[PDB]
Design a protein around this ligand. Structure first.
Ligand SMILES: CCCCCCCC/C=C\CCCCCCCC(=O)OC[C@H](COP(=O)(O)OCCN)OC(=O)CCCCCCC/C=C\CCCCCCCC
Ligand SMILES: CCCCCCCC/C=C\CCCCCCCC(=O)OC[C@H](COP(=O)(O)OCCN)OC(=O)CCCCCCC/C=C\CCCCCCCC
Ligand SMILES: CCCCCCCCCCCCCCCCCC(=O)OC[C@H](COP(=O)(O)OCCN)OC(=O)CCCCCCCCCCCCCCCCC
Ligand SMILES: CCCCCCCCCCCCCCCCCC(=O)OC[C@H](COP(=O)(O)OCCN)OC(=O)CCCCCCCCCCCCCCCCC
Ligand SMILES: CC(C)CCC[C@@H](C)[C@H]1CC[C@H]2[C@@H]3CC=C4C[C@@H](O)CC[C@]4(C)[C@H]3CC[C@]12C
Ligand SMILES: CC(C)CCC[C@@H](C)[C@H]1CC[C@H]2[C@@H]3CC=C4C[C@@H](O)CC[C@]4(C)[C@H]3CC[C@]12C
Ligand SMILES: CCCCCCCCCCCCCCCC
Ligand SMILES: CCCCCCCCCCCCCCCC
Ligand SMILES: CCCCCCCCCCCCCCCC
Ligand SMILES: CCCCCCCCCCCCCCCC
Ligand SMILES: *[C@@H]1O[C@H](CO)[C@@H](O)[C@H](O)[C@H]1NC(C)=O
Ligand SMILES: *[C@@H]1O[C@H](CO)[C@@H](O)[C@H](O)[C@H]1NC(C)=O
Ligand SMILES: CCCCCCCCCCCC
Ligand SMILES: CCCCCCCCCCCC
Ligand SMILES: [Ca+2]
Ligand SMILES: [Ca+2]
Lengths: 184, 605, 46, 605, 184, 46
């Protein structure tokens, strides 16, 4: 209707969404900040229409997530500290329930790594444990947890989990596709 | 030449199809999509005519499927409701609501199947009945003047007598005329038999399709898992659906707990203790639980027996079997949980034991109820020989059970959740003991018990839909009311549990229990159809000596006698029994083979 | 209006209209009975 | 303290148990064994009394098992024979001989089961029969004086008439007295029924145990394989059993050929060709093959029908059904292979098609033979009403079929292998065409056809062992003769094939075919027992209206009537049919689930 | 009888054989060379009674094997170019049919490697192909075969198969336990 | 010795003893009918 169809066909071909989901997400994005989002949004405007990280993290589905910053950063475009409509659609098509297990595993691994070197180092594990727990476990407890995780999840003796072993170990979890889910 | 072109076109089409399942940015995805689209557009002329037509019709089918999905999304209800429940309470509480919505869809499909082919043709035929008709069916569709006055008594209506007895809701209302009329020739008894068969077939098909979709994709890689304690409790320790502050703090505390006793248990690894008092308490609990199960059986049997009246001698005492069954079903689990608390087991094994005991109670109660109802029907038919209508009576019993179960569920929601919450809020300051932190803390959702309620109700619907054609139609309203009342109760009166465990951490556990219940409920319907004989003044099968005759009478109209006699030897006991034993043996050995293969699949990885 | 043949319809109608009014009232409201753990801890501390 | 000691003892015992399965030198293995033995000896005093007794009895059981294995190895025959055949011809030729030796062991076990409990008690009772006996059984154990003179006619003996008819080899010879005698009270009809049941149960159990042993260990890791062409054809390209020079050169040539067309086929990857002549030849071959199958059916039916005489009108024409069946079975595969050669398919797909056609021919012939025999028996019983003995007659038919099959196999070995080899050796110099290199090259072993012969013969034995108690005893001699003649023929007349392919490269293919044959053969026996009625002057069941009565008559002697009547409702068609349909549906869906799991097991590796 | 029992119990505990198999193999070993094998063989004599490689390769079960030298070398004792009774028992217990798949795979890998560095290099593959084929394939054919085998059997990009990948690829062969078998 | 009642036993006995003698003879012998491929190639070359 208001938008060109070809955009809708492209979005449905790229994402898991339908026309209703695209329209609902556009309404939510516009309601996030009406000043920085125009009404008519035909053309390359979705690539240039942008919002900051604070506005996206203000949303209820992301506000209470300890890894809200990581979720915003993983789906970020070439611009740093920013999110566009295409990034919004990536974020809410990866996180949806209809997404396959492989995509969830891959983006979860990309989220859990802060440096971004395709390797789950000790510092990343400690940072994510302290983010999830909010500094309630003792330092000795954190070290013990990381040591056990490395022992039972590292097979190459590298003291750092990678994509293969992480995917092997947490894809047989009967609670991953149930937990790693955001409804919108 | 052509082979390479076809291979390239197939590869490009496969890339386009699997485009969404790759972790690329939308710019990269759009680039690849446009590149492949241009490649296919320029390469479409290289293939032959057959390949071009195949691709064209495949594209048309894909476009039609996409349009159908776009239109179908508009009709899915309770999106915001489940979204809110998920945000406030978690992703294991909302499993019950997603299960209930799927059950609603299945029940609506069953209702449409039984309404298009049975109820509507009969109503249309009744509305246009001429003088020649309306007399062959007056004895079943018109309430007699003797009992017409007493149709509104608050006990005739409550027992589904009066006008409801002579309504399309029951089996005996339908005429046994072989054809609806001239120029149409619609066989209604055959429609009745085929619809009852089709509903069970579709129930099996839908349950198995859901099970396959959940197992082949979701939990396909989830099998063959070994140990992995800390990684499971850490990487899957946060529910991403939760968008509530208090629930998030509760989840953080739960994760800290889980990790702390994880390291505590893995540290000592020492398990030495033996107290005679604890063992005596455990055996006493296990004995009193079996005593309560026996009491349940005896109460159900007594309740069925004492309802020995068919004429209106008294109705304040006839309606006691639905009340007794509902009371047992809705009260005994609470006592089970109390005895389990006294037992003092580990929380996971305590929950598993409670679920097992509830399942055993439900199955035993259902079996004894069926046996008592069948014995009562046999005794009534023997004493009868103005012929009685045992099918309509069985339908009435099942409908009354469903209605009283709904009433008891509503009362339980009102008392356990609302009134208890109000009492704790407005009376914990000056109570004798600290109730807000004591045994009745504030109230919590019970996903497993509620799902078992849904499964038991659906089993009751499956059991009695042959005798009550409009039982799924009533179940639609019952399920909608249940969804709304459960959502409101959980939103208003319940608090998120500190940590909630799962029976097997699988979505197919409840589907498997539902499939077992479907088999358990289709066994006695098949036995009734094969063994029992219809009534001579009721229903569409009043002109036959069996229920299945209306089918076989038409099979014999097209098949010779000699070939039929040759076929009738496949039903020999000496051919069925070896086949059953062979299936049992092959299942037993294939069980060990499959368990070994599944165990070695992870080892070979 | 016989008690066993006309009164119960009147009672049922009154109950039904009251139930409809209550449901509509609780449809536009967002009651929340239990108090948060912070309030419980504050009350316990007193 | 005690927990650590128990864990250490368990670990040391586990190390000792799995010692042989590790790749260590003998010195290292001895060192580890002595170390663990000393550790256990010094640590045995740390455990409690219960653990000590458990370990002591486990050690005693292990010692007894080892002694039993040591004694059992002494009784395994044909070790050097199979060793020589393996060395000369390979490890796929010797698969037939290992299969035949296992079949011999199974048949010997069946013979012992049917000989301890049936034949021996009856013979002992007959030898001690007093004047009171020997008159109730004279009509079945003594040949009448009318036909005693004509007992040796070369046609009475060849048809198992005369003395063989009144021998323990047949059903009608056994008395129907409920007890063998006083002070013993041995129920012989019950022994007969129970032995016939036990033989089938043990056959199923042994076949399934062999299948499980071969699948859970040998081919457990062999499943879920993908591509791997060159590595399979190279690392498993040499048979390590071969110890012959010429066979080794043949194997080297075969490996070279395999690799050469491997690279040749992987190189071009181009498959474009369509000749109408080739397609016409293929469809003509497929039509003539079905024509030959129909000719086989018609010939079998005609042969059974024309043997309509029961009295000794003529015997040179009555013995034509075993000859016809044997001729078809032993000749049609050759024509199948000739037609396949004309078809010009790939060798592997040609072999698969030939095996499938042979299996279809065998199954169809067996089914039509059973139907014709059953129809003939029904017609004979109807025309009878000095009562005839249809069980003894069926036993005679099966025994004659087995004997003629042995004769035809011996003749085929003598002609195809010996005489053809001699003709090629002594006549290829001056023949019209080069036969030594032409179509009849020199002769080769056919593992699949011979294994199918063994399976078909065992199916014939299973079918007719209820009517002929001493049919497995005869099959023992038949199988020993077959083993010796096949070994001699392959050693003396056959040459190693240039390259021999396998049907599925599995050892459980033939076991699965054998299990299917066992089911196919136990179906008619169960039908006979459940449906047909015994003879009133034959066998141990002459006092009952059914075969199974002798069982139920004793079940009713201990079980009440009311509970029996309640149980008799489990055999309703309306309970069996939904159960059968549920098993069918669960098998169908579990098939897709298992195939997906097996496919993804390799992917997850 | 002639021999002490304790030796027989040790041999049964270590190998797959029974007393009859031990006696038969001892008779065959003595018949291989009666001069170098004493009649009474009690004590540590099995470790010191030794035969050369030529005598063992002269046996029919090993004479036609292209890898007879490798089979003799893998099971060889500390002494180079020698085989003792314990080596005989190791060789004929590994090769037997009752041996598990793992032992066959491991000793086959040890046989197929000539240098003995736990790695299946290109030179080992070429040597074993030319030994199995007897120099009938062309050089280009051998290079193509090795290239395809490396491509379809190497996953780490090392251009040299190791224990793990070899075991993964040839243990699913339905003809390995049937071929890798020596009856004696 | 009737042809149909006594001759066939004599024929069977003669055949059985001849078969036993043949089997015993071929028991201590190692016949091998086909010639090796080398001999076939030599004959073809001539
Ligand atoms: C507020 C909006 C009101 C919209 C009115 C809709 C009218 C009700 C239609 C039936 C409602 C069925 C229902 O409750 O939804 C369940 C059901 C699916 O359940 P879930 O699997 O749990 O959800 C999908 C997540 N993977 O939803 C649907 O399928 C939508 C059906 C709408 C009509 C579709 C028309 C085609 C139906 C024939 C399909 C045959 C399949 C066999
Ligand atoms: C020359 C030596 C002569 C020895 C005379 C032995 C007398 C014959 C005894 C029966 C022969 C049975 C036979 O043919 O052997 C087959 C059979 C095994 O067949 P395969 O699995 O193919 O071989 C094992 C390779 N894994 O061999 C045996 O089992 C030996 C049986 C000897 C007697 C054992 C006594 C115990 C029998 C009861 C076992 C019950 C199991 C059920
Ligand atoms: C046969 C028996 C028939 C009885 C029918 C009773 C139907 C009542 C159930 C319907 C219902 O509960 O509606 C839901 C309603 C509020 O639900 P909710 O969507 O959460 O509120 C929206 C706020 N924005 O929930 C409510 O308003 C409160 C529910 C009151 C309980 C009704 C029964 C009392 C007796
Ligand atoms: C009912 C019909 C009963 C007929 C019984 C016939 C029994 C003959 C089969 C027995 C047999 O073939 O014995 C094997 C014998 C040689 O076998 P082999 O072990 O290889 O020789 C050892 C050499 N060291 O093989 C032979 O000696 C040659 C076989 C001759 C064929 C006998 C039948 C001819 C008719
Ligand atoms: C298709 C799915 C939804 C199942 C619906 C039930 C089917 C099996 C039932 C419902 C109505 C039935 C038909 C009703 C009337 C007729 C006309 C007459 O010639 C007898 C058979 C026939 C043709 C019946 C065949 C079976 C039938 C088609
Ligand atoms: C054990 C395996 C080998 C099966 C053998 C067949 C079994 C089932 C058969 C063979 C002989 C049978 C017994 C024969 C005679 C008696 C004595 C009398 O009281 C009736 C039952 C009883 C006791 C039978 C029970 C069943 C029986 C033991
Ligand atoms: C573990 C389950 C315990 C459930 C206890 C329910 C208590 C219900 C009390 C109802 C009180 C209603 C009157 C309130 C008076 C202020
Ligand atoms: C009463 C037992 C019900 C069994 C449910 C079977 C579920 C089938 C799916 C498998 C889920 C794994 C847990 C079991
Ligand atoms: C492919 C199977 C072909 C089988 C051909 C068998 C030929 C048998 C010929 C028998 C000749 C016997 C007389 C020999 C005269 C020297
Ligand atoms: C006539 C078909 C027979 C099927 C045999 C089933 C064998 C079961 C073991 C599986 C072996 C794999 C090849 C199939
Ligand atoms: C209607 O029923 C009455 C019952 O007495 C009957 O007499 C009448 O014939 C029926 N209708 C017709 C066909 O007139
Ligand atoms: C033996 O059989 C004869 C048949 O006439 C019978 O008369 C006799 O009584 C039987 N034996 C006895 C019991 O003497
Ligand atoms: C009546 C006493 C309880 C009987 C049922 C116990 C079921 C336990 C199920 C445990 C499954 C792991
Ligand atoms: C009668 C024509 C042949 C019919 C049987 C063909 C069986 C082919 C089996 C192929 C299995 C892969
Ligand atoms: Ca890192
Ligand atoms: Ca190397």
């Amino acid at each position: 209707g208001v938008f060109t169809r070809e955009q809708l066909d492209e979005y449905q071909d790229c994402t898991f969404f339908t026309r209703k989901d695209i329209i609902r997400l556009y309404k939510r994005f516009y309601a996030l900040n009406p000043h920085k989002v125009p009404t008519n949004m035909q053309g390359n405007r979705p690539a240039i229409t942008t919002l900051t990280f604070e506005e996206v993290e203000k949303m209820p589905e992301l506000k209470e997530n300890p890894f809200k910053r990581r979720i915003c950063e993983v789906f970020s475009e070439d611009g740093r500290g920013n999110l566009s409509f295409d990034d919004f659609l990536d974020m809410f098509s990866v996180f949806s329930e209809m997404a396959p297990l492989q995509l969830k595993l891959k983006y979860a691994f990309r989220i859990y790594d802060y440096d971004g070197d395709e390797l789950l180092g000790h510092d990343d594990l400690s940072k994510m444990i302290r983010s999830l727990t909010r500094d309630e476990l003792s330092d000795v407890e954190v070290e013990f947890i990381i040591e056990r995780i490395i022992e039972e999840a590292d097979l190459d003796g590298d003291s750092s989990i990678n994509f293969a072993e992480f995917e092997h170990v947490v894809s047989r979890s009967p609670d991953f596709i149930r937990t790693f889910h955001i409804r919108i | 030449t052509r082979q390479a072109l076809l291979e390239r076109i197939r590869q490009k089409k496969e890339v386009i199809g699997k485009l969404r399942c790759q972790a690329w940015s939308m710019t990269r995805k759009r680039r690849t999509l446009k590149l492949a689209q241009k490649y296919l557009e320029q390469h479409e002329s290289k293939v032959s005519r057959s390949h071009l037509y195949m691709e064209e019709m495949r594209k048309r089918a894909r476009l039609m499927k996409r349009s159908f999905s776009n239109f179908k999304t508009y009709l899915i209800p309770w999106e915001s409701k489940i979204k809110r429940i998920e945000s406030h309470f978690g992703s294991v509480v909302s499993s019950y609501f997603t299960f209930l919505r799927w059950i609603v869809f299945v029940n609506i499909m069953i209702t449409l199947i039984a309404l298009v082919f049975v109820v509507l043709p009969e109503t249309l035929a009744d509305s246009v009945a001429n003088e020649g008709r309306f007399n062959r069916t007056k004895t079943r569709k018109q309430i007699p003047a003797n009992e017409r006055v007493h149709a509104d008594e608050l006990a005739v209506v409550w027992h589904y007598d009066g006008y409801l007895r002579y309504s399309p809701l029951f089996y005996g209302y339908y005429s046994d005329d072989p054809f609806l009329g001239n120029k149409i020739k619609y066989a209604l008894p055959l429609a009745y038999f085929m619809v009852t068969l089709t509903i069970f077939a579709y129930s099996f098909f839908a349950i198995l399709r859901k099970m396959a979709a959940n197992a082949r994709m979701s939990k396909l890689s989830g099998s063959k898992a070994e140990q992995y304690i800390f990684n499971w409790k850490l990487f899957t320790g946060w529910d991403y659906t939760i968008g509530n502050s208090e629930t998030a703090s509760n989840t953080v505390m739960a994760v800290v707990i889980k990790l702390r006793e994880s390291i505590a248990d893995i540290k000592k690894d020492a398990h030495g203790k033996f107290r005679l008092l604890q063992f005596s308490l455990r055996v006493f609990a296990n004995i009193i639980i079996c005593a309560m199960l026996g009491f349940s059986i005896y109460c159900i049997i007594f309740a069925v027996q004492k309802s020995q009246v068919q004429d209106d001698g008294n109705l304040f005492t006839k309606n006691q079997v639905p009340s007794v069954v509902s009371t047992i079903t809705h009260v005994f689990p609470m006592i089970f949980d109390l005895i389990g608390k006294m037992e003092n087991y580990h929380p996971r094994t305590a929950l598993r034991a409670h679920l097992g005991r509830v399942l055993i109670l439900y199955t035993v109660n259902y079996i004894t109820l069926i046996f008592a109802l069948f014995e009562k029907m046999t005794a009534l038919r023997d004493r009868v020989n103005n012929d009685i209508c045992w099918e309509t009576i069985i339908g009435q019993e099942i409908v009354k059970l469903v209605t009283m179960d709904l009433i008891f569920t509503i009362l339980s929601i009102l008392v356990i959740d609302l009134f208890r919450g109000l009492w704790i809020k407005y009376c914990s300051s000056w109570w004798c003991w600290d109730i807000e932190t004591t045994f009745p803390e504030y109230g919590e959702f019970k996903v497993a018990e509620n799902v078992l309620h849904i499964i038991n109700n659906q089993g009751m619907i499956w059991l009695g839909l042959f005798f009550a054609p409009l039982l799924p139609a009533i179940n639609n309203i019952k399920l909608i009311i249940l969804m709304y009342i459960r959502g409101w109760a959980v939103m208003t009166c319940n608090v998120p549990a500190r940590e909630i465990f799962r029976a097997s951490r699988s979505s197919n556990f409840y589907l498997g229990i539902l499939l077992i219940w479907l088999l358990l409920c289709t066994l006695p319907v098949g036995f009734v159809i094969a063994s029992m004989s219809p009534s001579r003044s009721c229903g569409p099968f009043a002109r036959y000596q069996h229920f299945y005759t209306v089918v076989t009478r038409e099979i014999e109209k097209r098949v010779d006698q000699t070939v039929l006699s040759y076929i009738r030897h496949i039903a020999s006991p000496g051919v069925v029994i070896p086949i059953i034993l062979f299936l049992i043996l092959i299942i037993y050995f294939l069980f060990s083979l499959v368990r070994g293969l599944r165990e070695a699949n992870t080892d070979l990885q | 209006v016989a008690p066993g043949l006309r009164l119960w319809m009147l009672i049922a109608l009154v109950g039904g209209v009251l139930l409809i009014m209550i449901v509509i009232v609780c449809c536009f409201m967002r009651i929340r009975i239990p108090r948060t753990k912070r309030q419980i801890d504050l009350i316990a501390a007193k």
